[PDB]
Here is the input.
Amino acid sequence: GHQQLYWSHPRKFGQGSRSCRVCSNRHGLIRKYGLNMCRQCFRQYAKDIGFIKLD
Amino acid sequence: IHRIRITLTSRNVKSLEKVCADLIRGAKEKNLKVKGPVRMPTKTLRITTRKTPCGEGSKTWDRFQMRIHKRLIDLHSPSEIVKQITSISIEPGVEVEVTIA
Amino acid sequence: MLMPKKNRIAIYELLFKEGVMVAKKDVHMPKHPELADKNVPNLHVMKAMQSLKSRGYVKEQFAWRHFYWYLTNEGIQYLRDYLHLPPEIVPATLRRS
Amino acid sequence: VQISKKRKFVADGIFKAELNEFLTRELAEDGYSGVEVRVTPTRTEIIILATRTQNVLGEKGRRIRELTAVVQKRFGFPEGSVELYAEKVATRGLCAIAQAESLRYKLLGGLAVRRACYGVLRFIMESGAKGCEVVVSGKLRGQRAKSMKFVDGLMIHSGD
Amino acid sequence: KKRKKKSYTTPKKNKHKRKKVKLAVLKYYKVDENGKISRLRRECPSDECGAGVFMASHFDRHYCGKCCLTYCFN
Amino acid sequence: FRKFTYRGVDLDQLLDMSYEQLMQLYSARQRRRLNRGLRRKQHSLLKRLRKAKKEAPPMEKPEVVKTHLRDMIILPEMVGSMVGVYNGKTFNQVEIKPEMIGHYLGEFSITYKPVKHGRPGIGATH
RNA sequence: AGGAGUGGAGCCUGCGGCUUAAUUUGACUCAACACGGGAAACCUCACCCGGCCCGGACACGGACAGGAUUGACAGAUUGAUA
RNA sequence: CAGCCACCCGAGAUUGAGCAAUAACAGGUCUGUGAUGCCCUUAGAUGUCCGGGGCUGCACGCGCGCUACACUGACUGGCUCAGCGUGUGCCUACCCUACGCCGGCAGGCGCGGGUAACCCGUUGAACCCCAUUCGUGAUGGGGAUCGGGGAUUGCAAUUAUUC
Here is the structure.
């Protein structure tokens, strides 16, 4: 009866399925302004986001 | 009321000012009483990220800062005239929010 | 797949309404973003795509945890054959081109 | 339904990065060299500079119809309201990713690293460019990682 | 990845495999000299059962698996 | 000889007593599940424990119950029997006594463990 | 010349060896030891496990066309309402 | 001479940081990655649908740090001054959060305020502004060491983990 039993428990607090939006990676997710990436993808892809370094 | 408000926001100050000058000239090309561009405080967004992908070495961080500059142009005119002025090949990266009340 | 063939042909028809869409990389997602509330499991969507990958008439351009479908003329021919339907159903985008 | 300026600008950046990655991994063989986005009232246009425009457009524009068929189903573009454009790159010596992909698909075809690097060097300095650095690291041959540099002309290394 | 050492109980995830007759008639009865059928198979109110799909009732509860009904005669 | 009670009430009284002053007897636990409500997949454990409790062998303990779910329990009907609770790879056997009320079933599952025994030896000097 | 002074006092993710299978990792000279953006019911899980399911699909040969799933008040108990 | 040290005017006579070379390491990361090299992995699939323990252990060595040892002070409370920011939303309830009733403790419904310098905001704040027992102690420096109870985001607080 898995067809009506599929996805029984709503996992809403966890980010297993809400991990970094790029790939199958975790351990360092940041939700500043809703990035939903880890540090790796953000830093390598920060040139297209619009975040620049002049501090 | 016919006070049309453009909440125009962009990442570049120079492109923003060129857009504002072109818009206020197009208003100045017609008979429209206008206010000067109102510069709301730019949003400075800070993201401080560790540089080494795996924790090793000296504690080193990048500080990515995002400067968001926003002007408002509220002119006493029907929005159709402002839209007639609008078709001027708006600068990329400058977004327009239309407020009519 | 313990899944009826009629639903597989329904998936073929829904794809044939277009030429290529994208798939969400997940097997626990009950539904399909494009085929929302049509009893189309995402895991079986990638099952279908992996089957035609085994056939060798389709490919993918996976990016950002998202499968990117492909379709070659032989693959379109095979889908128009197994649908048991005329090739007259060309993608509607050319009717809106 | 309005959203804050920071979030909308980060969404635009996310969208642009997504297009960049997808088109770089999808059309690298066809010499994809850059994506730009423009907006008109209730219309989004995307212009794609490419080294191989005949290979980025396709026959009758069909691939473009395919391409828009893909993007429209990912980022939320309603059917039939998005168009894709392409312009030839003015020079291959003003963009680095073009020669990068050229090096990829010259070595992937089977070729000594040095020959391709020197071909790129002479192509660049017959383009009037003032300096080119191609650093290649890995295992050129054998089982050891040696980093080689193909350095031509002066090149600024610091500052604004 | 390394071995998890299925060595004590059955190391089998395979499904069931059964042998039976080619002509298995359990929805009807034959050798009856009757063109009609005396209805010993329970009437199924689901709109998925015709004359080729019925159910068999045991001493324990009423079995289902199509629409989750109950015809209980325990 | 020594006197033990549950603050003037027993399982029988608490069965007769309604939840009104039971909440006053409740420490802090298992109260908001009523306001939250009970979900699906949660109707068989009570039936199974009651069915086991109905038939109790003479001079023998109630039959072992294999449970893989940590089920929140709202009533003291469990007290007076035995439970086979989860350890991690086996099912450990528990006698129920008046300490069960005032506590949760999951509080009897204590499982934590060291690596091995040793002292700082040849390898570790400083 | 001098300055919170951490070193000296009981409370930290983690260090190095430290009770009943899992307290486990990568980083021994700062430039590893509040570091891997690290306070963990669950996904904080890299770890004996109790295994709920194939998300083994398909060229070529099958007892080749009667293999299975959606069986939930059940006695059916090792997920009982698979 | 390049320059160094004093002085008057002056807002300012060294404001702080990101960019940082040629060339290289056998320094860490295959446990960051849909970037990857023969061995266990050939479906006997070190999480994968469901998910009920695990880096959540005790004898000690100067590993970043934590509140203090007190009267320049914790302490009834009087008066009143902040700046970067963060903020209702794609399988994103949950974000800040102006009153009536109640409830010391967290919080129930409403009229609304907020995509934003419009809403909290005049961050009335917060350190200090010294009128209260305090006097050299085990009480008030030092909650660091006990058992009960209201309970909001949390099916699942078992090492009252966290109010």
User: Anything to note?
Assistant: Residues 1-5, 9, 11, 13-17, 19, 26-28, 30, 39 of chain A lie near RNA strand G (CB under 10 Å from a C1'). Residues 19 and 25 of chain A are 7 Å apart (CA to CA).
